[PDB]
Design a protein around this ligand. Structure first.
Ligand code: 2VQ
Ligand code: ZN
Length: 257
């Protein structure tokens, strides 16, 4: 099946998922000088005060912290979005080294990791239906650089021991995603796709300009996870990022000057 190895990685995905070579694939390189300030972009509205996390899962390629999305409890609105998008889960993409790991790049610069908070458009009823729509998802991406520790990320780091391998999950209630946000909500936005198969072109990407800092110990813990299932040869979960794709006929807009 697909993965991030030499034999099933990003360069192989198009065989099972031809949309991999589509017109609006993600991630992309964000050329800061070419992105255009768009005064008509409304401020982003992140309302996570009532967020209800439920569980954390190692799915074989990343770990997802899942939320109750059966009601508007944690939503993203405003910015380039029309309507309300509900948070369903968040996960990360990281590298084997601090010099790589992010999916989006800024003027070709790669960050140590990238957090994706996935939200779906409530006008579509459920996530499964939303991904079949061009404006079905809104994914908030936040770059991670190594430096000082991120206090709000520690609870996630500490539970990873319990979901070391593919298929393992653990209760993960009362986690506050507001603790993973940088100070500024300035962002770049463009129409794109999921960065993992099925690579559906249903995402409005909102990538924050300001990265958050995590400690070397925190990211090191990410790199101890396994792509493999328990009782299988150990393959460390590292470099689970897709490289930048052709921008093609798209313009990246900036919410700031
Ligand atoms: C939203 C979604 N559908 C399928 C998967 N998956 O297979 O992991 N994801 C999560 C990773 N996709 S992403 N990077 O574009 O947010
Ligand atoms: Zn992702």
């Amino acid at each position: 099946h697909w993965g991030y190895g030499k034999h099933n990685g990003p360069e192989h995905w198009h065989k099972d998922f031809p949309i991999a070579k589509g017109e609006r694939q993600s991630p992309v390189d964000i050329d800061t000088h070419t992105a255009k300030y768009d005064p008509s972009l409304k401020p982003l509205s992140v309302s996570y005060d009532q967020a209800t996390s439920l569980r954390i899962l190692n799915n074989g390629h990343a770990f997802n912290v899942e939320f109750d999305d059966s009601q508007d409890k944690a939503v993203l609105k405003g910015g380039p979005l029309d309507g309300t998008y509900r948070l369903i889960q968040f996960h990360f993409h990281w590298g084997s080294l601090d010099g790589q790991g992010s999916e989006h790049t800024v003027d070709k610069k790669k960050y140590a990791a990238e957090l994706h908070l996935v939200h779906w458009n409530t006008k579509y009823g459920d996530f499964g239906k939303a991904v079949q729509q061009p404006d079905g998802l809104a994914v908030l991406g936040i770059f991670l650089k190594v430096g000082s520790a991120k206090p709000g990320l520690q609870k996630v780091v500490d539970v990873l021991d319990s979901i070391k391998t593919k298929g393992k999950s653990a209760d993960f209630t009362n986690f506050d995603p507001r603790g993973l946000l940088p100070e500024s909500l300035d962002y770049w936005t463009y129409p794109g796709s999921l960065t993992t198969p099925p690579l559906l072109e249903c995402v409005t990407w909102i990538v924050l300009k300001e990265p958050i800092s995590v400690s070397s110990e925190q990211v090191l813990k990410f790199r101890k996870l396994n792509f493999n299932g328990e009782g299988e040869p150990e393959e460390l979960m590292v470099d689970n990022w897709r490289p930048a794709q052709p921008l093609k006929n798209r313009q990246i807009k900036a919410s700031f000057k």
